[PDB]
Amino acid sequence: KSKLPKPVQDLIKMIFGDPIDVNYEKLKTDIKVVDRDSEEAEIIRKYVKNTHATTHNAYDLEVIDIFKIEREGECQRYKPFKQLHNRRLLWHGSRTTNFAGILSQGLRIAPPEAPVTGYMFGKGIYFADMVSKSANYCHTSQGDPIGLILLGEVALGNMYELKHASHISKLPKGKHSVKGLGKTTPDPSANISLDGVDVPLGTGISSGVNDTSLLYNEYIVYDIAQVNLKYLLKLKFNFK
């Protein structure tokens, strides 16, 4: 029998579809349950509440569990970016069947053999500031309505801000990331800081950007070391 807390046991069962504690160790990730009552949990629930897009109206989201995560070796990998400016807490969704690999190997760039279809700025690691934009990538359904989503600290630095698809060969000198500019953005006046990381949990407003292909922002880094995975949420999708 497992010596892990029940919510972690349930997470492992979800990810692996060996004993629980053996499957836990395969993730090479410290997983802690975040207390419901805590400042962190309050902030995260607000981020989920406030950044569900109006056009993503097929479902609403309920947070079941919040986990704080620390991948083995992450501290030393992220160190060269830990002091870069413009570090933001951003969403990344993925199918549940991908999470064993994501936690054990981290988020990775798609290999050459994968289609570039779906990647408007070329292969990289993609994030949203609107929970629903990322939650769509969980590919949940009425029959399978529980999904997993990440919050990563992403070291964005100087952003190369684009409005139309462009598979850039290289970042311009002095740039660290790409930001796709959407028509709607979390209200920047509502940004808060959590442990030195900016959290854009404002309700969506018009960005005032015209001549753009994107409804909502997206953020791309091209070096896996610019990501520090921080939280993993188990979400209930309530389909309408």
Ligand X SMILES: NC(=O)c1cccc2c(O)c(Cc3ccc(C(=O)N4CCN(c5ncccn5)CC4)cc3)oc12
Note the residues at the interface with ligand X (CB under 6 A).
91-94, 98, 101, 118-119, 126-128, 133-134, 137, 218
Measured in whole angstroms, how far is the alpha carbon of residue 224 from the centre of its chain? 14
In the complex, least distance from residue 6 CB atom to ligand X, rounded to whole angstroms: 27
| 94 known member of a binding site | yes
182-186 and 214-216 beta bridge pairing: parallel
Q: Is 218 a catalytic residue?
A: yes
In the complex, least distance from residue 165 CB atom to ligand X, rounded to whole angstroms: 10
Please, are residues 223 and 78 in contact by the beta-carbon 8 Å criterion? no
| 213 known member of a binding site | no
- What counts of helices (H) and strands (E) characterise the chain? 6, 14
| 101 known member of a binding site | yes
Measuring CA to CA, which residue among 208, 172, 158, 169 is closest to residue 187?
208
User: Of the listed 42, 153, 161, 218, which one is catalytic?
Assistant: 218
Q: Closer to ligand X at the Cβ: 23 or 98?
A: 98
Q: Where does residue 28 fall: left (phi above 0), alpha (psi -120 to 50 degrees), or beta otherwise?
A: left
In the complex, least distance from residue 128 CB atom to ligand X, rounded to whole angstroms: 4
Render the burial of 97-124: b for 16+ CB within 10 Å, e for the rest: eebbebbeebbebeeeeeeeeebbbbbb
| 134 known member of a binding site | yes
Q: Closer to ligand X at the Cβ: 35 or 161?
A: 161
CA dihedral 91, 153, 174, 185 (to 10 degrees): 40
| 108 known member of a binding site | yes
Contacts of 37 (CB under 8 A, 6+ apart): none
In the complex, least distance from residue 216 CB atom to ligand X, rounded to whole angstroms: 8
Q: Closer to ligand X at the Cβ: 105 or 203?
A: 105
Q: Closer to ligand X at the Cβ: 21 or 63?
A: 63
| Known binding residues for NAD(+) | 92-94, 101, 108, 134
| Known binding residues | 92-94, 101, 108, 134
- Which sequence positions are flagged as catalytic? 218
